[PDB]
Ligand binder design. Structure first.
Ligand SMILES: Nc1ncnc2c1ncn2[C@@H]1O[C@H](COP(=O)(O)OP(=O)(O)NP(=O)(O)O)[C@@H](O)[C@H]1O
Ligand SMILES: *[C@@H]1[C@@H](C(=O)OC(C)(C)C)C(=O)[C@@H]2C[C@@]1(C(=O)OC)CC2=C
Ligand SMILES: [Mg+2]
Length: 359
């Protein structure tokens, strides 16, 4: 039956059909997941972001990502993870079900924009501390992100930082992905881009890349393709040890081993004082502490790379430490088989439909 509670508006090519409470939709984002609109929620009396997922059950690749983002957004409640305000489908039946609409708080900026500003040590360390808190919270429920990037981290005018997405799940970070959209790889750890095993501190590499960018004002490892990405890492940080090499699959290993041998540059040369606030005693010490933290996160071999907990305890970060945010109880994920399931198209359609309905 027609439900008078919905209306339709065309945003670019695609149509949004939303509850009438959501007014004045404006497109703010696009990508592989779907279209994001800013809107005014007349019931909450605040601005929100509405993301449309089109036919998320269409194949398992789409379905696994949609499903886990629904489940996790609903069961996580943490200052540094984007919250779910609402979720709905305009279609009225399982048979007719097509689209899912995610409603989130509308944040004021993404971290790309925040990076463009000149940030003193207190602002950089606070934003990094918050990133570490959010990552630690995910890790505590066994969720390793693997794809953290500034475009998927947003910030509020009160300085609260929130991670927007939940990462690569149990997929291969060097397997083919059918998609028309560009995929940003600048922040992915060596072990991801070389197709190696990983552990929690895979996400520390990404934090290091973001921190270095915050300081320098440009992407640290802006590879124009997979080839270039690796080249840019080794040129700056040095060729990794033979022990690390022995982990690589034959084709990758021969390539990596036959690159020119780079010594790398010191973190003092990579991140000179000129790039930092450094007009005082506090600020000069802080620059050394920052380089010390970078030198522990931007480590190619993850077995020698610092952990999230160790980073939270680092003198650059720990000035902000509060166990209410840094030692929160882990998310309780209700689906005990999250990320361990293979399903047919119709099974995924019903799982995602129920998730929307809490049935
Ligand atoms: N809740 C939100 N508050 C503010 N801006 C948001 C919000 N959600 C998304 N955005 C904006 O949308 C941009 C990209 O959309 P996003 O939510 O990442 O999904 P997507 O574009 O469908 N997939 P992808 O680009 O691969 O991450 C971000 O850089 C933000 O600028
Ligand atoms: C705000 C922020 C900060 O990063 O602000 C933007 C505008 C995003 C650059 C901090 O990192 C902490 C908290 C602060 C603030 O005004 O809190 C009320 C200043 C600061 C050091
Ligand atoms: Mg995203």
């Amino acid at each position: 039956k027609r439900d008078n509670n919905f209306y339709s508006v065309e945003i670019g090519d695609s149509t949004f059909t939303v509850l009438k409470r959501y007014q004045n939709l404006k497109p703010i984002g696009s990508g592989a997941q779907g279209i994001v609109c800013a809107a005014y929620d007349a019931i909450l009396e605040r601005n929100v972001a509405i993301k449309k997922l089109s036919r998320p059950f269409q194949n398992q690749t789409h379905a696994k990502r949609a499903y886990r983002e629904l489940v996790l957004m609903k069961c996580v409640n943490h200052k540094n993870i984007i919250g779910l305000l609402n979720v709905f489908t305009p279609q009225k039946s399982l048979e007719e079900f097509q689209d899912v609409y995610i409603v989130m708080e509308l944040m004021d900026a993404n971290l790309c924009q925040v990076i463009q500003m000149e940030l003193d040590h207190e602002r950089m360390s606070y934003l990094l501390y918050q990133m570490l808190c959010g990552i630690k919270h995910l890790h505590s429920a066994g969720i390793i992100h693997r794809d953290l990037k500034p475009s998927n981290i947003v910030v509020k005018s009160d300085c609260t930082l929130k991670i927007l997405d939940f990462g690569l799940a149990r997929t291969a970070g060097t397997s083919f992905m059918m998609t028309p959209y560009v995929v940003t790889r600048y922040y992915r750890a060596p072990e991801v881009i070389l197709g190696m095993g990983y552990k929690e501190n895979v996400d520390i590499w990404s934090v290091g890349c973001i921190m270095g960018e915050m300081i320098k004002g440009g992407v640290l490892f802006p590879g124009t393709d997979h080839i270039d990405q690796w080249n840019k890492v080794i040129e700056q940080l040095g060729t990794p040890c033979p022990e690390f090499m022995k982990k690589l699959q034959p084709t990758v290993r021969t390539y990596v081993e036959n690159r020119p041998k780079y010594a790398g540059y010191s973190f003092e040369k990579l991140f000179p004082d000129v790039l930092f606030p450094a007009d005082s005693e506090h600020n000069k010490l802080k620059a050394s502490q920052a380089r010390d933290l970078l030198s522990k996160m931007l480590v190619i071999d993850a077995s020698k790379r610092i952990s999230v907990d160790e980073a939270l305890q680092h003198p650059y970060i720990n000035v902000w430490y509060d166990p209410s945010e840094a030692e929160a109880p882990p998310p309780k994920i209700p689906d005990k088989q999250l990320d361990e399931r293979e399903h047919t198209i119709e099974e995924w359609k019903e799982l995602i439909y129920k998730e929307v309905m809490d049935l």
